[PDB]
Amino acid sequence: RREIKIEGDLVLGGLFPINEKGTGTEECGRINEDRGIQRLEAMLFAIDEINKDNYLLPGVKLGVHILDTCSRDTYALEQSLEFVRASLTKVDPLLIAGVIGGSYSSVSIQVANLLRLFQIPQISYASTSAKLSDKSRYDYFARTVPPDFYQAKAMAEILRFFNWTYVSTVASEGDYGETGIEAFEQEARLRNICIATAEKVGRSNIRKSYDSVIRELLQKPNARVVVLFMRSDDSRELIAAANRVNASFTWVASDGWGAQESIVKGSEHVAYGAITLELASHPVRQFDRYFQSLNPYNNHRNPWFRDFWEQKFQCSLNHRCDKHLAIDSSNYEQESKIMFVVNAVYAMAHALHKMQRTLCPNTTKLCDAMKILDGKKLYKEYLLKINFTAPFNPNKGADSIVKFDTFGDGMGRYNVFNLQQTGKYSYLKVGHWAETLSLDVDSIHWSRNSVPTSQCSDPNEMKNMDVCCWICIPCEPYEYLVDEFTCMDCGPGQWPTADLSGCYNLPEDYIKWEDAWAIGPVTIACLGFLCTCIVITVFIKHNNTASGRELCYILLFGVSLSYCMTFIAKPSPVICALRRLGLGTSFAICYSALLTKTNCIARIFKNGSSQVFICLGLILVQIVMVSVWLILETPGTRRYTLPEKRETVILKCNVKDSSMLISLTYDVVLVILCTVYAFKTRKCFNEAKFIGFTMYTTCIIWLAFLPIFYVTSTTMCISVSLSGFVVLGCLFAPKVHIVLFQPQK
Amino acid sequence: RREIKIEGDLVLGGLFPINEKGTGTEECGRINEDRGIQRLEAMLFAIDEINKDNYLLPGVKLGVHILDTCSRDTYALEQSLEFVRASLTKVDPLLIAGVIGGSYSSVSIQVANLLRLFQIPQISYASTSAKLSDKSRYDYFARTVPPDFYQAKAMAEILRFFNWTYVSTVASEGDYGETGIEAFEQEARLRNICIATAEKVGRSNIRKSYDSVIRELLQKPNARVVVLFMRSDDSRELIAAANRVNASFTWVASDGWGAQESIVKGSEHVAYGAITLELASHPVRQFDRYFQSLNPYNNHRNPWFRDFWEQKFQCSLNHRCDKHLAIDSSNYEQESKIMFVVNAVYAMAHALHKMQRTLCPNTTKLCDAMKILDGKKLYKEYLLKINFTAPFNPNKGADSIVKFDTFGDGMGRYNVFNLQQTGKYSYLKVGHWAETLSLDVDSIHWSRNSVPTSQCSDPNEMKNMDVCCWICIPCEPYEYLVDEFTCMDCGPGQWPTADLSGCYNLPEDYIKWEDAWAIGPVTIACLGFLCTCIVITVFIKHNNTASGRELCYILLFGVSLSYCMTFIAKPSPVICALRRLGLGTSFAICYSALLTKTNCIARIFKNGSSQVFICLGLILVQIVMVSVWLILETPGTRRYTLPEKRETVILKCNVKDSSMLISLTYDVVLVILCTVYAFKTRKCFNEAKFIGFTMYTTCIIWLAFLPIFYVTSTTMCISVSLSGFVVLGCLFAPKVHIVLFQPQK
Numbered sequence A, B: 001r002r003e004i005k006i007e008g009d010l011v012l013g014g015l016f017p018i019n020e021k022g023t024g025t026e027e028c029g030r031i032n033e034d035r036g037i038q039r040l041e042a043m044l045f046a047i048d049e050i051n052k053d054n055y056l057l058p059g060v061k062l063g064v065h066i067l068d069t070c071s072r073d074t075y076a077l078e079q080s081l082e083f084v085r086a087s088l089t090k091v092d093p094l095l096i097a098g099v100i101g102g103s104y105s106s107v108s109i110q111v112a113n114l115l116r117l118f119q120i121p122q123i124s125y126a127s128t129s130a131k132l133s134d135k136s137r138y139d140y141f142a143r144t145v146p147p148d149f150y151q152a153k154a155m156a157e158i159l160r161f162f163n164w165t166y167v168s169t170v171a172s173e174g175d176y177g178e179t180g181i182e183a184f185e186q187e188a189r190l191r192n193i194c195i196a197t198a199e200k201v202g203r204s205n206i207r208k209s210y211d212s213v214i215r216e217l218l219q220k221p222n223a224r225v226v227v228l229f230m231r232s233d234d235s236r237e238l239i240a241a242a243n244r245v246n247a248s249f250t251w252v253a254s255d256g257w258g259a260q261e262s263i264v265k266g267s268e269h270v271a272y273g274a275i276t277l278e279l280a281s282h283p284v285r286q287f288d289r290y291f292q293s294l295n296p297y298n299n300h301r302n303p304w305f306r307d308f309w310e311q312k313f314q315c316s317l318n319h320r321c322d323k324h325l326a327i328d329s330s331n332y333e334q335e336s337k338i339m340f341v342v343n344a345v346y347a348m349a350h351a352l353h354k355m356q357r358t359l360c361p362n363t364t365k366l367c368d369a370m371k372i373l374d375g376k377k378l379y380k381e382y383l384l385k386i387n388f389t390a391p392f393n394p395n396k397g398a399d400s401i402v403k404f405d406t407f408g409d410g411m412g413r414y415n416v417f418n419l420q421q422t423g424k425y426s427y428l429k430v431g432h433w434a435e436t437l438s439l440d441v442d443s444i445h446w447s448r449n450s451v452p453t454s455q456c457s458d459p460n461e462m463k464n465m466d467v468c469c470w471i472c473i474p475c476e477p478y479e480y481l482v483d484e485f486t487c488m489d490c491g492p493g494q495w496p497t498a499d500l501s502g503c504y505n506l507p508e509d510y511i512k513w514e515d516a517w518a519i520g521p522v523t524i525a526c527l528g529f530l531c532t533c534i535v536i537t538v539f540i541k542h543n544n545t546a547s548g549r550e551l552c553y554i555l556l557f558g559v560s561l562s563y564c565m566t567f568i569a570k571p572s573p574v575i576c577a578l579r580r581l582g583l584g585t586s587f588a589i590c591y592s593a594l595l596t597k598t599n600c601i602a603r604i605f606k607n608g609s610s611q612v613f614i615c616l617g618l619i620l621v622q623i624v625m626v627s628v629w630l631i632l633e634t635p636g637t638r639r640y641t642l643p644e645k646r647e648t649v650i651l652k653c654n655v656k657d658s659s660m661l662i663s664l665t666y667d668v669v670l671v672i673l674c675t676v677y678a679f680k681t682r683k684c685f686n687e688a689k690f691i692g693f694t695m696y697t698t699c700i701i702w703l704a705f706l707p708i709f710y711v712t713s714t715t716m717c718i719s720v721s722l723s724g725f726v727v728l729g730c731l732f733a734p735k736v737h738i739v740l741f742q743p744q745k
């Protein structure tokens, strides 16, 4: 029953959330101080200016009929019956020309359903919902604010500028809530952003108590950023709930939080470093002088003013204030959406003015054609196509024109704010969004002094798979990352290095390839023993002071050290069939010299020759001839590849054996020398015993080389020393030959 | 302007979706045939019976005022103004006592917001929404149907009976849609059920065209079951959309689909084998006789009847039908929710009757206390506490009583239906839900002749991690599954079998343990050569036909075969220090016999004894004495554990060497025999040459055994043969001893 009623030629209706919603069974509680009284006085300020105007409806007078919604749709519908009571019954009164819509989206939707049955146009400030643009249902609705379709974009792009991909969302209940968060999740999918958890709040049948949600947000510590689509009532509670548990996140809030300094009262340190959006606006300078001149004495026409005055100053009319200073800059700051309220009222003023110019061109008063207002004509023809410059706002660009579009909406421009500290707390604009996000990172005061990170999983290891959570799996050094999501093998000899995007570091040693570089050091150590045999053989030759034959055998024994060192022309002489033939001839060369000195010069014939000597020398020549024909292709490498990936064949100047060629060459070389041993075996002479005694050791030495001949990998180097030891053992036979002589010469 | 108006002492208001929603700009389209006219005639049937009653309001007469909603909330609000026009203006008419609520939940919510301002009670059949129970807002609402809080339970338990854990949900838009699916996802979490995808349908700003959703359902083939919370309009479209793309799922639908045979018309094969819920009900037998007697001639009072008649028979009043049979069993079947409609009307009848008994006890007519109905008194005191037996329904248990509860709701009982084929199609009830799911699996006709499965991931392999999707990772046979979600290691010798929940099959061969069982077969093959030495030694002894000393040496040589076979008392004689000492004595025993026969009986003294003989025999006695003191602990096993897990030591009666004990024993045994070899080495006699010649082979044989002594793993068996070959080589020395003799004896 409490209202403001100022009569006039034409009457306007208003709906403001002057009183905050009640706690329990009471309808509505305390007084809304910023989004309440201030917005109410803005409409009363504009009406005064319009009646003072001369080019905007100078003949008619504008009246008002302002009610209060108490931030409830059910309470709003009951009040809104006064705007339709006169028109409902007419056959046997105040006829409202239009309604300045409510603030909350649920209130605007509820009223727009009723007024559309009477063809009464409605413009709603501050109500930004995407579902209010469906003109097939709300065919008499318009607004001066952009929809929420553009607010979801502006926050899905801040979460993409910073690489925040794992987030958690909290939304209110109503129509600003679910519809706001339903649009956000579609804009998150297009940018590969994942949602950890999605909760809801409210007042009925949701079961949070604002503490279950806080715990549910703490169950996913990998998501350090929370996206909020909530009203002003729920934003104060959730911050207070987080203060008790002493939690801390970074808050990304829509315009419901806005840039109010009252939501974070008493719980500042839990909201420090927040990031919030707010519609673009410019303060109306003329309004500030109007508000600051008000006091409970001269402001008789405002009924709710007395309740506002006491609540703001903690006085009463519990200290009972007379000489108390009125509203001034020390305790007052203009609300953000005052410009949108003034613009909405002028929208009715210009739309009605064009009606009067056309329908009654002769007179400036209300002609008889205005006795019955046409709601459909005033909306579809006049209101929806207005265009004028914003009053009280000096030209600031493209935002100085008040105009609707095909859906009867506004322009999607936003700001970006951040909560900081200087112990005093305040906001600071650090960004913008006009179809493109353009913010300033440098000035931001972050929550924990560093840019927060929130991704599902942390980043030479494969990582397979949802586009946010992976598993870092390492793979063995014999597999290379073909792509970032797979490592499958690598090269046999090549040893990949650093990132294994390919197979690098071509390994000269791969079993089949001889890495070498260390056998030379082993050869140097082994060369000392070989030189001793040459040195020992040299001393034996000097003791001679027939003779040429003994020297030739020593050369074959001496050639063993050279053959052992070359075991030659290239780094890997074993490669190629000729190399095996060439190596086999050297072994048979020593045997041939010893075999020739055995019976070649030992006269002719106990119980127990030109043809035999020719046949014996023919085999060596044939072996030498085969080796001679293999002069080319003497180089090569030994094939000893084993399942172990690191198989560098350490040998003198690399490992060169021709793989299976050396195996045949090793057996063939024994056969060439075996002819001399076999010939001497048919003697079962003192010199024969020395040859036989040396022959017995040769058979034993060959047996030891047999495991070495089939043993490789080191083991091949040990087997290599076995071949050298065989030459040294053969040199032992030359020592027996020196024994097979006479002293005192 | 089209309505039914029958005057009376008290008037009731109704709201029915008689006309289906319009296609485009037209308000409402064709005629709803089952949930339309039939439900309308049910209320007109009950009103006729009540006026015929004598114990239920016999003095007053009941009137009706029935309107049509065209399945739209906006159209419903416009019509519902007739019920409040008279009461709104009274200072200077039909006063509706109550309203039989609408069918769709959005319609009921919209009207309940308006009627609560005039204190007009409303009972709504067929409207099942969870948010309508919040009595703080809807304080004048009641229903005869259970809320949707119980429908979500009854389907989250069918998805738990069958192990369907990966599902996809499709929901409508309105209040029956989102609120129905928001309750389901909470009941799915409590049973570890996961949601693949969640889509929405509608008519504005959702952007499906019923084909994007179908494709989105096909992008997750692992989810073969779809859960539907949709109205009757969207259920026909989505089935038609799936028919074009020729897709196929199994459908789990709420009561919006119900058990109608019209949703699946023309697209049966895409809905075959569906599973749907429907409220528990029993057909009203009296109603069937009433409906079947109707025809467009005697049913003057029904305005929409003529449109219904032509649409049902494809006639006109394009063939123009007179002698056409009326409604009968050949083309008619009673709708499910006719019992709930009749019950709601009687709820007003009994509530009003109790008012008349109390307020006007003297007269059966309307006393002056009824000139002003008290809406609050009629609802809170009388209507909400009624209790009576259901008319026209014979006693069928606890469902025969019509009663509300604290919230003004009904009882949560449901049925379970299934779509089958006999080419004709029909439904069949195969289940029930009264606080407990009790269905019958056997009779179900499944979509693809088998029980469908839908889980995120498929089931000796670890499976780690969301409670639906895992990764099956196998682990190597040396690791056992400590739990189902981890395999980390196993036992060294034990070889796990079948499921690796533990480490089983205690491996007797673990490198450190000797598996054996195959060395015996190798010993048998090796025993043949050893027997040849014994056989050869036996022949040498028989040739003798001094002597005792030679036989003792042969016994030491013969003991080598026994020592080799025992290399004895236990399966692994090498274990224990005594075993190494015992084995070493056997090797020194042969050397001692040969050493004693060398110079013990060879007189006293080229250039080159009791004390020396005593000292030489003392070492063998000390070695034998040490071995004798180690009689106990002769058993044991050889330690040859290597990184390869399968390390069964194959040897005669297992591998027994005492690990490092055998290594010391092998070296110690050589030292015991080395004393004899060292003593003979100081001779640089024909027999000395034979001993020296045999001694030379012993040094070479020891060198070969040196790699065998340090070579194991097979290799140990080869090394074992090396020790046996050493005994055979020593037996070769006894052959030289036989050579060191005289023939012709």
Ligand SMILES: N[C@@]1(C(=O)O)CO[C@@H]2[C@@H](C(=O)O)[C@@H]21
Binding pocket: A035, A103, A104, A105, A106, A126, A127, A128, A129, A176, A230, A231, A232, A255, A256, A337
């Ligand atoms: N955007 C809001 C809406 O109701 O649509 C959310 O809460 C605040 C109203 C206001 O600023 O007055 C807006």
Ligand SMILES: N[C@@]1(C(=O)O)CO[C@@H]2[C@@H](C(=O)O)[C@@H]21
Binding pocket: B035, B103, B104, B105, B106, B126, B127, B128, B129, B176, B230, B231, B232, B255, B256, B337
């Ligand atoms: N449960 C429903 C509801 O509107 O709440 C869903 O669609 C069908 C109405 C009917 O059976 O008449 C019901």
Ligand SMILES: [Ca+2]
Binding pocket: A015, A016, A017, A069, A071, A072, A102, A103, A104, A107
């Ligand atoms: Ca409001």
Ligand SMILES: [Ca+2]
Binding pocket: A104, A105, A106, A107, A173, A174, A175, A176, A177, A231
């Ligand atoms: Ca809202």
Ligand SMILES: [Ca+2]
Binding pocket: B015, B016, B017, B069, B071, B072, B102, B103, B104, B107
């Ligand atoms: Ca309806």
Ligand SMILES: [Ca+2]
Binding pocket: B104, B105, B106, B107, B173, B174, B175, B176, B177, B231
């Ligand atoms: Ca609905």
